[PDB]
Amino acid sequence: TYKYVNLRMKSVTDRAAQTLLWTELIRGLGMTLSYLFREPATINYPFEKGPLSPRFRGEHALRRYPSGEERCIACKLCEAVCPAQAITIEAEPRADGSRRTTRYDIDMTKCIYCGFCQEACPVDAIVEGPNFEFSTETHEELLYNKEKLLNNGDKWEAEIAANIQADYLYR
Amino acid sequence: VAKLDDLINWARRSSLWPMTFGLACCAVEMMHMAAPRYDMDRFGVVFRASPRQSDVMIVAGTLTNKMAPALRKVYDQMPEPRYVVSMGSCANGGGYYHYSYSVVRGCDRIVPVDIYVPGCPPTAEALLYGILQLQKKIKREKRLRIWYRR
Amino acid sequence: PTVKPPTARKFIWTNHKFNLSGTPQQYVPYSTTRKKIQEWVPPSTPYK
Amino acid sequence: TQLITVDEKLDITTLTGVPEEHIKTRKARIFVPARNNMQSGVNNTKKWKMEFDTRERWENPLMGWASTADPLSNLVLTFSTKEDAIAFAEKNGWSYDVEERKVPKPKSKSYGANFSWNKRTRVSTK
Amino acid sequence: TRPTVRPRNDVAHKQLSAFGEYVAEILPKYVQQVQVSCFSELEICIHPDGVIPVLTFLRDHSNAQFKSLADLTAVDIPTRQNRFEIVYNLLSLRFNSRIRVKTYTDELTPVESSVSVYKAANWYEREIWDMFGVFFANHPDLRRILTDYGFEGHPFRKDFPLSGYVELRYDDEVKRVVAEPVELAQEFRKFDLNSPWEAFPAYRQPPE
Amino acid sequence: LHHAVIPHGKGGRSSVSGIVATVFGATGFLGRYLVNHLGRMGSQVIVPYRCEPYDTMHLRPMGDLGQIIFMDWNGRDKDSIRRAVEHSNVVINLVGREWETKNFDFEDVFVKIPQAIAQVSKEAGVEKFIHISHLNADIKSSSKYLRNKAVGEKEVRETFPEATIIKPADIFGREDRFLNYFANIRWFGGVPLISLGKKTVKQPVYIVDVTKGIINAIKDPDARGKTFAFVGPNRYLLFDLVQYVFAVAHRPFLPYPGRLFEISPFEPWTTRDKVERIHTTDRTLPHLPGLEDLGVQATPLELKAIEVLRRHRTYRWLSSEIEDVQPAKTV
Amino acid sequence: TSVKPIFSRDMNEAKRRVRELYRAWYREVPNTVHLFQLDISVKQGRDKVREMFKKNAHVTDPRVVDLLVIKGKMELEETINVWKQRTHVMRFFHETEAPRPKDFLSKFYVGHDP
Amino acid sequence: GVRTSPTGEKVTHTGQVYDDEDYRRVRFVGRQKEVNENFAIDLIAEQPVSQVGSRVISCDGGGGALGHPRVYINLDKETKTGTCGYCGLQFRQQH
Amino acid sequence: ASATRLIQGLRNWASGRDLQAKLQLRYQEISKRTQPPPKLPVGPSHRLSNNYYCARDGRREAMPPSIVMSSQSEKKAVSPAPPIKRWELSQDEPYL
Ligand SMILES: NC(=O)C1=CN([C@@H]2O[C@H](COP(=O)(O)OP(=O)(O)OC[C@H]3O[C@@H](n4cnc5c(N)ncnc54)[C@H](OP(=O)(O)O)[C@@H]3O)[C@@H](O)[C@H]2O)C=CC1
Ligand code: SF4
Ligand code: SF4
C-alpha cells in the first residue's frame, strides 16, 4: 500500500569516476541533444489552428428559426441562471402580440464563459458560439447589444447549426 | 519621413518584450501560450522580468485593491513607448468578481489599456491573435508623418 | 465543406467580415429602448 | 472575578467602519413581508426582515443601466422575532420604523352554507 | 431507496454518540451540547471560557488524539446576541476521525486564543479578526492578513454590503491611486428566489 | 433641456453632470487637467486630437465608459470642427504653441483657429464658449505671442459676444514650462537673467485653481460675457522667484546678469519670445473679477513649489521635508 | 450587564491607553512625513491625528474604546514599519473629493439626499 | 425594410432612434450604427398559412428536439388563424 | 516520423531508449474528429409502474441532528472509531 522513496572498492571507484568524469551530466546532455533533434510542435499560426471540439465555448450569438423569425421568446432564464449577472433583458410584446425582447445586453467583460445560458435556453436562442478571435481595442466594443448578437448569429449560423446537430444528442 | 516611420514601426513590432506580470488563472494560460505548442518566441516575443527592459505588459488575473499601487508603479517604471494588454475578464471589467468589495472593476481605471482580450481564460490562440492585433496596431503608427505635418 | 455544404438559409451572410476594430465600421454600444417617461409639452396658446 | 460592569447602551457605530452619513440619515424598516397575492404559500411570512429605503437609480449614459449610488440598496437582514431586530437596529445606531405583523383572522368555513334553505348564502353555480 | 439515495451508516453514528457521551461526561464544566448529525459527524458545543481546557484534552488524551487542526471558522448569525459562532475542526489520525467544537462570542467579548494548542491557528483566527472583528486574547502577532491596509470595517459580517464603501481609481491630478465613494455603473440586481411553500416537514419549527 | 442631459446621481464617476464639453487641444497641460477634472464629475467630453493616438492614451482612464470621445480634426478644416461641436453645449479653447513651427506661425494658432471655432460654434448654436488668453496680452507688447493673443481675444469677443474669456497669469504645475524652465536653465550654465531679475513682478497661479475656476465658469450662468483675470494670490520679484526655485531644489545659486536653441528639429528648449515673456511684468487688473469671485481658494507658491520641483533634486537632497526651506520674499 | 474585560478595567485605564496612543502618534507623525516623502507639513498630520481623536471621542464603553486603542495600535504598527504606501497614508487626506453641500438649499438644488 | 429618421440614423426593429437634439448621437460620429437588416416581423409575415385536417394541431417548430417545446393549438374558431406561441407560425382549417 | 534512419539511431543512442516506439506527437492512430451519433442510455427510474416518487426521495429523508446530551455503572472508555490498521508494504515496488 505504501513505499519508501529514497531509502536505499568497485562501487567507490565507480562513484569517484562519475565525480571526476561527469557520467550522469553526460547522460543529461545526451537527453538534451536527443530533444534537439526532434520535430518541434510549433503550429504555424495564423495559417494553422489548434484542435478544438464542437462543444467549444466562444462568442455569444442569438440564433433564428429556419423561417427568418428570431428565436428568443423573452423568458429571462439566461439572466436568471447567469452567475456573473452579465445579461440584461427588457421585454415587451411587439405589434403582432408575440412575446419578444426589446433590450438584450450582454456585458462580455463580465461574462465568465461557462455556458449556463446556452443550456438553460428552452428554445436554443442564446448559444455560446465557436468564435474565439474577437479581441477588441476599446472597452465599449466588448459590450454587446441585441443587434450585435443577432448579427453574430446570422454570421455564424452556418457552423453553429452544424455544431448543434453534432452535439445535441449528448444533452 | 514616411519610410523612416515604416522602419521604426517594423523594429518595435517584431521585437516586443513582455513582462512577467501574471496574477491568477490567466497567468497559467499565458504560460501555456509560451509552451512549444504556440511558441511566442517565434514572433520576437521573449519574456523579460524587469520593467525597465520591457515593451508591453499583459495584465493577467484579478487586480485587487491591495494590488493597484503595485501595478501603477510597475507601469510607471516602464520606458516609452509602452502598451498595456488587458486579459481575461477580471482585468477587463472585473468579470466574475465585478461586484466584490476588494476587486478593481477593470484595470482601465489604473492603467491605459490598448488591447482587450476577452475570455475566462482566453484561449492561447486567441491571445496570439490579440498580440498580432497589437502588432498590426503598432504597424499603422504615424509618428514621423504627424511630426512633419506639425 | 466542398463535399458537405452547410444548409442554405435566407438570413446567412453572403460575405464574411474580419475584425473591424480600429476602423470606421467598428461596433459601438447603444440602448435599443425608447423613452421611458414622457414629458408634459406646454401649450402654445397664450394664457390670457 | 475577572468581570467588569458596564451600564451603558451598546453603540458600535465606531467599530463597524461605516461612514457617518450612512448612520444618521438612513431609516431602517423592520417588518414581516406580506404574502405575494399571486401565490398561496405563507412560508415567506415566517421571519422578520430588516431593510432600508430606496435611493436614486438613474440611467447609464451608455445603455441606460440602473446606475446607483447607495451601497446599502441590497442589504436585507433576517431575524427570528421582533426584539432581536430592534436590538440590532439600536445597536448600530440606525433609526428604525417597526411595523407589527398582521396575522389573518381564523375564518369559519362551512361547506353546508352553500346549500342553505332560508339564507342568502345559497350559491348560484358549482 | 437504493440507487439515488445516500446509504446510511449506523455503527459510526453509535460510536460517535458514545464518544460524545464520553466527552460530555469527562468535561462537565464547559460542555453544553453534544449532537450527532444525520451524516455521522459529531458536534460539541461548549462555553467560550472553556475553549482552551477542552481542546488540549482532545489533543493530549490517549482516547481522542485529535492531533490535527483542519479548519477554524467563525459564522455570523445576527439573530442571536452572540452573533459570532467560532467553529474548530479537529482531525484524529490514530483513530481516523473528525470532530467539531463550537462556541459563541459577540463583538466586544474576547476569546482565548488557541496558539498554545495548535500553531496553525496562529494564522487562522488572525484571519477571523480580519474578516469579522472577533478579538483573540494573547495572540502573538495579530494584524490584518486579507483586506487592504487602510480598510475600515469587517467585510464578512452580514450587515456589511456586498460592494464596499470605497472604490479605487488612478488620478492624474495627484498622480496617485485614490479612494472614492462607490458608484456602480449597474446596480446589483437582487433576486427573490425563495419558494413560498414549506420546504421540509422534518425541520418544522414550532410556532409562537 | 432634454432628459438625457438632466443631471443625475451623487456627482461621482458614473453620474451625469449634464455637461457636454468640446476641449480643443486637450492633449497638452491645461487640457489634461481640465479633462481629468471633467471626467470625475461624469460629463461627456469630446477630445479632438491633432497628434498620434498613442499620445492621447493618458486621457483614457480619466473618464467612464464612453464619456470621452476621441476625434480627428484639423486647424484649417472647418468641417472637422463642425463634426466636433455639433452636439456639445460648452466649447473650451486652449489651443496654443509657444513656438512657431514650419507651417503654423503665431497668427494662425492664436487668431485664425479661435475665430474659426467661435464662428462654427455660433453657427451650431453652442450655448457656452470659454476661451483662454494671456493676462499680459497687449497690442503694444514686445513679443509676437502677446500681440497675437490680444488680436485673438478681440476676434473671439467680436465673433462670439457671449464668450467667457479667461486670462491666467502664469500657470505652474507638474508638467509646466515656467518653474520647470527655471530649474532646467541650470543645465545651460549660471542661470542667465537680465539685470538679475530685480525689476519685473510675477504672480504665478496654481493649475488646480485655474481648472476649478474654469469648471465654476462652466457651471455658473452668471459668468457669460465676462473677462476673468486668473491671478495668483501673491506677487514675487523675478530675483526672489528664482531664489525660491533654486532654494527648494537644493542647488547652489550662481547667477550672472535664446534664439540659439529655438532652431532645433526637436521641441525647442528656449526661444527669443520666451526670453521676452519672462522679463514682462504682470499687469494689474483690479476692475476685472478674479478667482475669488468664483468661490475658488487661491493656493500660493509656498506649498506647491516643492511639489513641482521635487523631481529636480538629486538623491543627496531627496529626503528633505516641506518646511526646511526659507520661503521667498513678497513685494 | 456583567461583561468580560479585555485590557481596561475602568474608564481611567482606557483613557491612559488613549493618551499613550496619542503620544505615540504625535511622536511618529514627523517620521511618517519624512520617510514617505509626503508633500504636507507636520502640523497638518498632527492636527489630522487630533481631528480623528476628537472624532472618536463620544464613547463611554470601556470595551469599545479599548478596541479603538487596539486598532490604532494596528495602524501605528502598519505605519512604523513600511508596509503601507504613499496612497495608504494619503487616503486620510481626501484631496480628490469635491466639497459636498451642507445647507438645505444647495442639497435641494443638487439631488434627493435627505 | 429599415425606415430612415430624418436625422440620418437608421431605426432598429425595436423602434429605437435617437432624436435630432440628443447629444448621444455624437457616439456615432466617425463610426457606424450597427443595426440588423433582417427584420423578424417582416420575415415571418410572408410565411404561408398551413391548412390542417383536424381540430387541433401540434407545433414543435421543426427538427424535433432542436426546436421549441411542443404546443397544441386549437382551431375551433373560423375567424382568426391559430398562431404558435413560440415560432410565430399560423395554422388554420380548410372548412 | 519524417526523419532519416541515422538521426533515428542518434536519438535512440543519446536518449538511451526507443523514442520511435512511443512518440509524443500525435498521428493517424488517434480517433477520428467526426463520430457517429450515439444513443444515450436511460437511468434506473425511467419506468412506468411502481415508480412513486415518495418511495425514493433523497432530500425528504434527511433528519435533524440528534441531540445526545442537552443543557436546555463503570462504563468502558470508548474511542471515536477503531484505530487505523498498520499499512502494508507494497509487494509490487517496495523500493527496498
Ligand atoms: N505658459 C503657459 O502655460 C501659458 C499658457 N497660456 C495659454 O493657455 C492655453 C493652454 O496652455 P498649455 O496647456 O500650457 O499649452 P500646450 O502647449 O501645453 O498645449 C497646446 C495644445 O494645443 C494643441 N495645438 C497647438 N497648436 C495647434 C494647432 N495649430 N492646431 C491644432 N492643435 C494645436 C496641441 O496639440 P499637439 O501638441 O498634440 O499637436 C496641444 O494639445 C494656451 O492657449 C496657452 O496659450 C497662457 C498663459 C501662460
Ligand atoms: S456563459 Fe455564463 S457568465 Fe456568460 S452570459 Fe452565459 S450564463 Fe452568464
Ligand atoms: S433563455 Fe433563451 S428564450 Fe429565455 S430570455 Fe434567454 S435567450 Fe431568450
Ligand code: SF4
Ligand atoms: S478572467 Fe477567469 S480565468 Fe482569468 S483570472 Fe479571472 S476567473 Fe481566472
Ligand SMILES: [Zn+2]
Ligand atoms: Zn411552434
